[model samples]
Target: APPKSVIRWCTISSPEEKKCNNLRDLTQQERISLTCVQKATYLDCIKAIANNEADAISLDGGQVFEAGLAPYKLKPIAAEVYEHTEGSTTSYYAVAVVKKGTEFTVNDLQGKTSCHTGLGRSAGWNIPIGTLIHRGAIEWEGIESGSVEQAVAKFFSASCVPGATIEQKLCRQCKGDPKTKCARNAPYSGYSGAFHCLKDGKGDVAFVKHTTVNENAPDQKDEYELLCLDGSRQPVDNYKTCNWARVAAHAVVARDDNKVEDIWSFLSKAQSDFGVDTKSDFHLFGPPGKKDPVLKDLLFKDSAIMLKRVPSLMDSQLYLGFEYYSAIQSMR
Candidate 1:
């Protein structure tokens, strides 16, 4: 009942704001009411949405976890779907990509340098770290005393986990502005950046999504391999067997009392109207501008092919599954 005629979207960065603005202007011509609200950070957007200051925002799985907790209480209404066989999935695999000839398995990662997309991100930190903890590969000295960050710092010789400010070792491999070593925009901070970190010999392994290596270094496919759970290595294409976990895709989240169905239907229509296939300056799934390719994935991930509605019965915990949910719980 919260103003069903309009949808107010919350954007975290300038690039995202431009995309949201474009979306607002374009949708206006079609008589679909939309507005953009800029927040300084993703967490800020979550708070804004919770307080009814904004209507919706797209968030990764890890962010969804925080947004769904306590005062925020946001729930995912639509999930971004990527290309797949029939019965498309709103999920991706978290994999450990290593340069060929590194010759190490998941079990022998002790003291090895590592690269990660970010500290609390699903693929980069949550799944891989959670899996290691569950498998007893990285010893967790009881949740009551030792922290996961401390355990990880001891496990890897060095790492580049963006947003890991409290632990110096976690940001040792990072190459960002000196003042903000492991900031999200750091040199080795994102999925592609983490891959480059491994490619440049900065780290022994990179924790990233399955599509990262192929998407960033397709020509050098043979130069890299995936670390499987069974102390084996496989070609990057063998992610189905080698992945650490199957993670939920990025999703559009909103407050529980908001017009969830209307928002989903509007997003469904928006994707159809301005989705990736449209060869234009403004694409619903593409970056806002072509000049700065580094600022991609403005409002939605560039890889997304479609938007799927979340089942009404599923909240953040159910959407992420009990296993993955428990993994995040153990870390936090």
Candidate 2:
């Protein structure tokens, strides 16, 4: 016995547009219930989650680090499992992609234009920028402004982090300003968006997950190369051999309080019963349905095996680790 429903999950996809509606039908069954609290970008939903404006949201591990930060002490209530040819995992890898023959090592992207998945994300923001900051390849004026974002803004000659706003000037290369709409609504924000940033010649390099290029452009594998910290380069398929670091997969997160049990109960049945199986009437972890690649994977991890509880507060930090976590904190 409760009141109404959860928003029930918050995400960057627009609710009015119906870009994230896979969960709508399944949650409507007489027993279980959930609803979406949509926003213009992941950052907006994050603010919504922080101030009790919304309930749950599944986000990349980079933002997971931010959610664990102050102003919103959120926790992961359900994590995606990465199923491989041999087994499954709760982790994925991060990598930086550059045009073939760029000759840019991890140290060499000093003044080059960069593209990111989104602000405060793992593959796009933390791994590459943090690695650069740690190696002294990029000059961070932390002592001057105490803002890692400003330092990043100045580091790359220009960037197109789709969800980053005209207000934040993170969309420096895109036509999103007083003249145009911004947010992930821009052409360059998520996995495919960052890849297209490099593809469309807007950025010298693009930071994204390993499978992005493979899923989107499998034939043009020869046209791309990975920028390894060891100053080595590899083709698209060599992510296992050349990568930044393996990090946790995206997790459906929530505020750590009494509501956890409610979500926990909702997701357990939702995942077990209606996960695009033979008996599934609707899918919760299927494709983004008809959504574009930029908005694909909006509501749930593309192919999840299960949703587990947030074991402890320390486990979240341990998954992201100190070095990467430290990089995120420098901004705030």
Candidate 3:
């Protein structure tokens, strides 16, 4: 086999390409070879990696599940860590946040407005909607014939589900202009973005991570609450008991046969130099730039505090665990 000379990273969007280029330039000072490859979509990146045309790409939990399936057979080499308690961990709770005084519980979500981080995103889309499907709230028979977004569109009167522009009502409450509205980079597109949508009175509930409520509405903490699946509402800090699902954080995946150790070493060096609390010109886990209108989590998740290595024997299915992995399977 040829030596692992250069790691060719696959990027989906122009901003991600720009960030990948920046990483390429910065890592050169450390004598590491890095290259950035462009692809139109995550699935395209997966195919390219499987064919050895690309080395690696960062993916959300849902995308990780997709890449792990049949033809692609990608493995998660490293996971983006978002929290630091006292153990080896990389996961968060998906919670439904609603403003105080809303008389609706999780069971009464029908006809209410909704906000989401993005379509297919774990906390924002897959977990909540998948839970709804498992509990018989959202009826999803197939992705192509029936479609989950269409069902969500009927369940919620209006929503700001970024990346679900195919369904009109899903994007109806988004705060972007005609061109950018409901797109992944729209105003109400990410964890904080979705929470802002609820704060701005565009949606009744925001499907986001547990930390999102305090991060966005700390001052108005009492004004928002969490919708528990047990048919009750709770304080935002009670997410440990009320969240929809405990989702795996985003992971950097590559072909299962690829040089995963080299990938891990490269990520370790990159994060050590450019990770959180660094003084480098570029942040490996941040947006393109401070002034640039680019979206967050370009090369990696902005919320990631560091990169943690997943065990060599652990595939995506094992990394996502039984609950999340099974839920993703049901979504398909």
- The TM-score values for the models, in the order shown, are 0.90, 0.84, 0.87
Give candidate 3 regions above 4 Å deviation. Answer: 1-4, 140-145, 177-179, 217-222, 286-294
Model 3 residue 135 distance off true place after TM-score fit, in angstroms: 2.8
- Clash-forming residue pairs, model 2: 7-35, 7-36, 7-37, 8-35
TM-score of 1: 0.90
Query: Candidate 3: global Cα-lDDT?
Result: 0.82
Question: What tens-digit string does per-residue lDDT give for candidate 1 at 1-332?
Answer: 33337788998667678778887887775434788998766788899988888889988899889899998888988899887767577998899999998898998998999999887889888888888887887889567867888899988999999878667999889875786557765667667778878987889999988777766777887799999998999999999988888889999999887478667767987988788676566788753222222365667876677898998778999988887787788787
Residue 5 in model 2: shift from native, Å? 6.8
Candidate 3 residue-wise lDDT, 48-153, digit = tens: 9999898999888988998998888998988888764575359888999998988788888888899998888899999888888778888777776777878888
Candidate 2 stretches with Cα past 4 Å from truth are: 1-7, 15-20, 50-52, 141-146, 163-170, 175-182, 274-282, 286-291, 303-306, 312-319
Which residues of candidate 1, in runs, are more than 4 Å off? Answer: 1-4, 287-293
Clashes of each: 0, 4, 0
**For residue 112, what is the lDDT in candidate 2?**
79
Better of 2 and 3 by TM-score: 3
- Assess each prediction's global lDDT (C-alpha) against the native: 0.82, 0.70, 0.82
CA shift at 199, candidate 2, in angstroms?
1.5
